Amino acid sequence: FFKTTEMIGYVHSIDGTIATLIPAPGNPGVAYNTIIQIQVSPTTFAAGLVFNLEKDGRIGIILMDNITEVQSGQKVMATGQLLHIPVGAGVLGKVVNPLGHE
Amino acid sequence: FKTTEMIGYVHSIDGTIATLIPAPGNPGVAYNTIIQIQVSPTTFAAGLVFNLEKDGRIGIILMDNITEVQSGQKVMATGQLLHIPVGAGVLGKVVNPLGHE
Amino acid sequence: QQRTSSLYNKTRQFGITAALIEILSAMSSLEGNAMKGVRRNKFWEG
Amino acid sequence: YTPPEGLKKLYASDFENSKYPLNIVPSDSVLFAKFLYKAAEEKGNFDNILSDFQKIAAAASKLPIFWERTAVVEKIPEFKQLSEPTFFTLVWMQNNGMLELIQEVAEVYETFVNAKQKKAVAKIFVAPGGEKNVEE
């Protein structure tokens, strides 16, 4: 009865709007083109998209939000799902981001 | 130029550029300084430091006696930037960028 | 004729340079992304 | 350096393709850690390697900054007390110039040991100085 996420590794390097991740040994691993959450704080997360899966195990991440909050050594959780956004007649007349945030 | 201590040995030579592998203990070389490669026991060629690599390798731009430079030769560090003679004692003379007449 | 010839000779020079730079930027990337693995040899035997 | 015969024989084998408790993706550190695990498995003792890493970590705290780039494990007296497998690996790294991976090869080796011994480690992340209470 816990909201258990799926930690897959840590943040190794940051170059502007992209990042790289090193997987912790013996972890489930992340899937290609999936969304991941970088724990910038015990309650705040930054969205990233998987772009590369290298032989070394390193993962290429495209950051989407809260980039300034991202630092090397932070934890990363894997949602294990592709990108889904709100859709319906309730969004008409509104300004939104690609992530669906109004 | 006044030498202080050896700071490594010549490793590679690609035309007018060169690389230096560190001497034991990695004494270190200040960036953008002038170094003296012991091409001969009494002759030292001039080089300019332009890169300090993480491994300890130094990037050198050779200035003169490039042909004489060979891999394995010792390199000494002046510890100072390039300084050249200036004043009325140089007027009417022909010099090179290193200050040699 | 003297103004369009210069633009033609200036264009071919730029075209050659842009291509070779572009090829040699995709050669650097391939080399940079690649690296030499752990050297498995008798290091002690030296 | 005069490595022992057992390590020499193993170092020439394709141990990288052998079976291991876990299937970790190949890496620079992982090859180093697999070698230690394979060598220790033959003797059956794994805690010796862990002690060696502990000594290395303690010794490194006193070494000068950037000691991994001027490192000579043979001349360093702190590493003279290490086991043959660990000492061989350190020399092997110093030859590859990857002595900065010491703190990561150890993590992989511990993971293999825990998997082999059937131990599950739970990381408890706590605030600095807040580790006093861990009952929950």
UniProtKB/Swiss-Prot annotation, chain B:
It is found in: Mitochondrion; Mitochondrion inner membrane. Disruption phenotype: RNAi-mediated knockdown of the protein in procyclic, insect stage cells impairs assembly of the F(1) component and slows the proliferation rate of procyclic cells that are cultivated in vitro, both in the presence and in the absence of glucose in the growth medium. ATP synthesis by oxidative phosphorylation is dramatically reduced in procyclic cells. Signal peptide: none annotated. Coiled coil: none annotated. Mitochondrial membrane ATP synthase (F(1)F(o) ATP synthase) produces ATP from ADP in the presence of a proton gradient across the membrane which is generated by electron transport complexes of the respiratory chain. F-type ATPases consist of two structural domains, F(1) - containing the extramembraneous catalytic core, and F(o) - containing the membrane proton channel, linked together by a central stalk and a peripheral stalk. During catalysis, ATP synthesis in the catalytic domain of F(1) is coupled via a rotary mechanism of the central stalk subunits to proton translocation. F-type ATPases have 2 components, F(1) - the catalytic core - and F(o) - the membrane proton channel. F(1) has five subunits: alpha(3), beta(3), gamma(1), delta(1), epsilon(1), plus the additional subunit P18 (Tb427.05.1710) that is not present in F(1)F(o) ATP synthase from metazoa. Subunit P18 (Tb927.5.1710) interacts with the alpha subunit with a 1:1 stoichiometry; the interaction is direct. Subunit gamma is part of the central stalk. F(o) has three main subunits: a, b and c. Belongs to the ATPase alpha/beta chains family. This is ATP synthase subunit alpha, mitochondrial. The chain holds residues 46 to 146 of 584 of the full protein.
